[PDB]
Amino acid sequence: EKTGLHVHEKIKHMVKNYGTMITGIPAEILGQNEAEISVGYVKKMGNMKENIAEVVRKSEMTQPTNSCGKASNEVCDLLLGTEGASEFEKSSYQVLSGDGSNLKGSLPNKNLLVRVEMDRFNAPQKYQKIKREEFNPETAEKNKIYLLEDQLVYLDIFGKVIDLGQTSDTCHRLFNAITTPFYQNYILYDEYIDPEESAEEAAMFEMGEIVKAKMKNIDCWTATHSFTIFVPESDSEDTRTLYPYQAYWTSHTLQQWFSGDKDEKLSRLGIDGYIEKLALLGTTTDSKIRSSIYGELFSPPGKEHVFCTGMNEKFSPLRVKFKVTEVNPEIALQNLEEVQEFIDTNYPGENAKDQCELYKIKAQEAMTKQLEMRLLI
Amino acid sequence: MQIFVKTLTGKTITLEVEPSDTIENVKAKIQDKEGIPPDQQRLIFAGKQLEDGRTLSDYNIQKESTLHLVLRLR
Amino acid sequence: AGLPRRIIKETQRLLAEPVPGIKAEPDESNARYFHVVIAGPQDSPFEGGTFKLELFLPEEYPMAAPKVRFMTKIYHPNVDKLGRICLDILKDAWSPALQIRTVLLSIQALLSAPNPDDPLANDVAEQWKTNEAQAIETARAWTRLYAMNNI
């Protein structure tokens, strides 16, 4: 009698209730470390105890993480354990099949944990014609196209020069077709430029269609999002659904994710239904539906129709990468129960709200004591 | 050349870099070391946030420096 | 210069097919500068006000984001003391597929959907999150105080 739904149940209850506390950092360390980073916010005149008080009160050290990756990291070290997850780090991610195949097939009827990473295509959208005489790869702007008199290169994120397979005769033409001075340093995929207007514009159009072509065989990928999904052992093809666990930068915490029961709402999609949506993210070339689906899956509960609109329209194409492994209910529920010991031992209280309010207070005190120390001269 | 990054948890982690490493690079360094994407991290140094188009020498930090990794923002 | 076509055509499309509740004109001198009046949205504490903004296209415009400043005084937690707004993109930066009209629309939306959990003016955000109804009351007062009788 130690289930897969017993680990979902227990980790969800515990995140919901103790927030940042599931990490099991003492409040005294939060306090000191926050004091350290905030020493400089304290006013320098008046009575220092009050000035310190003012900084300590505005703090939010106890509010849970926000980084989608630090959240998924700490899910990992619960469900799997320190050494557990450290050697799940190793496993390389498998990019998702056009249709969803590899994931479905990578989901036995054990107690498994997929960790996803999601990449955005950070391809260049700036270009600059320039003389070769004045180039300097460690001096110029990275992730950009350079058009020399006789060669067409990409400077990449790390500052490597990557040649774009063009003859020097095509380069010569392009360089010299582009004369009007504010298009010397400008953008590749402008929609207001017309090939059937100038030779310049035909050039700018053409160079752009080169770059677009080359670029679909270059690792421009950078990581954007992180989450986990939890797939408890079922006794059926229907009595089986999945539970995704995320946070998001400047949006929501895992705590928040669970309290609006998004995990549950996405488990009511079905497993094929989830992966089919998730698979479409990486394959559609329509921004409006890339945005829709992104919201559906990754927004905080309730803001699904407004998370990816206007300014947060998703324009980069995305690449979902997954990696799987299994979870021994017995090692996980020991990880969790070992956290609940720590809490009840050091932050005793009979409501949980009370146990947190004690944590915060102990944090605040620690912080106050460090600042009091630091600023006595 | 080689720097430190302290989190609020006090988890210091150390990276090997180059003075002409862009700040967008250190975040990927961190990604490889911690599995946190760069879009879900924020680095500050001596008070000042660091922007993505700049380098460590442009912030004037080399050898045994600590950058604070910040994993909560609003 | 004053080109490219992009700026030219954006400026035409804005004058030709404007955004309901938003008027956005180029300055005679400086075609990269824009006087903007946004009406207080219906069903919001700013209903019946008009708010003046300046929108500047930085000289790298198409890929730098335009800078926006509220001229009119406004009691809103996403506009600082100097009338600056958060234009920040979420796990991304400004693409050139984002045009002036998207930012204008976005400010508009922000007036309808004030977000105190991303504060730019802490006193007012802090009052918006606890005494929302007193926040909104003062918001309506300010729009009467500074955003009525403006043309």
First-to-last C-alpha distance (Å) of chain C: 32
- The H-or-E segment that residue A376 falls in is none
Residue B23, both tokens: 């700040």
Q: Determine whether C9 is exposed, middle or buried from the number of CB atoms within 10 Å of its CB (0-12, 13-18, 19+).
A: middle
Residue A212, both tokens: 């677009």
User: What resolution in angstroms, rounded to 1 decimal?
Assistant: 2.8
Q: Determine whether A21 is exposed, middle or buried from the number of CB atoms within 10 Å of its CB (0-12, 13-18, 19+).
A: buried
B37 contacts A223? CB cut-off 8 A: yes
C26 touches chain B (CB under 8 A): no
Instruction: Sheet containing B66-70: give its strands across.
Output: B12-16, B2-6, B66-70, B42-45, B48-49
The C-alpha of B64 sits at a distance from chain C's nearest C-alpha, in angstroms, of: 30
CA B41 from chain centre, in angstroms, equals: 9
Q: Are A25 and B9 in contact (CB under 8 A)?
A: yes
The C-alpha of B74 sits at a distance from chain C's nearest C-alpha, in angstroms, of: 5
C92 contacts B74? CB cut-off 8 A: no
- Domain assignments of chain A as residue spans, ordered by start: 1-122+221-377, 123-220
Nearest CB to A67 within list B20, B28, B36: B36
Quote the number of domains for chain B. Answer: 1
Alpha-carbon distance of A70 to A171, in angstroms, equals 46
Domain span including residue B59: 2-70
First-to-last C-alpha distance (Å) of chain A: 60
- B vs C, Cβ pairs < 8 A, gives 8
The C-alpha of A338 sits at a distance from chain B's nearest C-alpha, in angstroms, of: 19
Distances (CA, A) of A45 to A35, A51, A112, A365: 18, 8, 57, 22
- C9 CB neighbours in chain A (<8 A) are 192
C62 contacts A190? CB cut-off 8 A: yes
CATH number for B35: 3.10.20.90
- B40 CB neighbours in chain C (<8 A) are 91
Q: Are C115 and C76 in contact (CB under 8 A)?
A: no
A251 touches chain C (CB under 8 A): yes
Residue A196, both tokens: 């059937």
Active site residues of C: 86
Strand duo A144-148 + A221-231: pairing: unpaired
A89 contacts B41? CB cut-off 8 A: no
Q: Which of residues 29-68 of B touch A (CB under 8 A)?
A: 31, 34-41, 44, 47, 53, 68
All chains having 3 or more CB pairs closer than 8 angstroms to chain A: B, C
Alpha-carbon distance of A175 to A166, in angstroms, equals 12
B20 touches chain A (CB under 8 A): yes
- Domain assignments of chain C as residue spans, ordered by start: 1-151
Q: Which of residues 84-123 of C touch B (CB under 8 A)?
A: 91-93, 117-119
Distances (CA, A) of B72 to A249, C101, C122: 7, 31, 18
All chains having 3 or more CB pairs closer than 8 angstroms to chain C: A, B
